[PDB]
Design a protein around this ligand. Sequence first.
Ligand SMILES: O=C(N[C@@H]1c2ccccc2-c2c(-c3nc4ccncc4[nH]3)cccc21)c1ccncc1
Length: 207
Amino acid sequence: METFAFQAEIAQLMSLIINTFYSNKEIFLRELISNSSDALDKIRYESLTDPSKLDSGKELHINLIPNKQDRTLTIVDTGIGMTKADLINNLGTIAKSGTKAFMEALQAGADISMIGQFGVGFYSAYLVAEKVTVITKHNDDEQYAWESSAGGSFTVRTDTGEPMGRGTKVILHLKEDQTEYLEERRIKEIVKKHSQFIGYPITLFVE
Ligand SMILES: O=C(N[C@@H]1c2ccccc2-c2c(-c3nc4ccncc4[nH]3)cccc21)c1ccncc1
């Protein structure tokens, strides 16, 4: 396990998301499903030129998995996944520029719900989660686990968990007062409201 420091802009956005009073927390789900949909679009588009890109899995889907015992909500996709370089470097570049643009927009009067327009919608996970664990497998790299409970750092390690084939799992370790996001009726309501037209099958798992 390697530990890394967030750059100042992203650390400030994470604190803003964690500290600001904002009741419309449900938008986190739309943001993570949109990220998954974008990753699925990417691998699907690559497979049009190279069909072997799907040798790691032909199914293109999104699963939403609640676990009441562990207090986790997991968003699983079979999209392109992220390499180690994406996790540490490339997405750090995106997080920096997107945070700067988002912070400028917020000062102008934009809403926290507009976060996705800035390419940093993933960070909306911190509206409901105390810790986010990301398990990911890209065709060009090994399976990795990225994790952060904010506080200015994140970790990255090779993951020894169940091999995924290809794709990403965003595991939300929910805050104690955010357990409504584990309820079937609540997740179904949110998906219908914000994610009804996503071009991949979304399966809401139950317990
Ligand atoms: O949401 C996704 N990716 C996430 C995403 C989207 C935008 C910006 C950063 C990140 C990010 C990061 C990350 N943020 C950082 C800030 C500073 N330094 C390094 C960083 N790495 C780590 C794991 C997952 C994601 C995604 C979901 C499904 N498939 C592909 C990507």
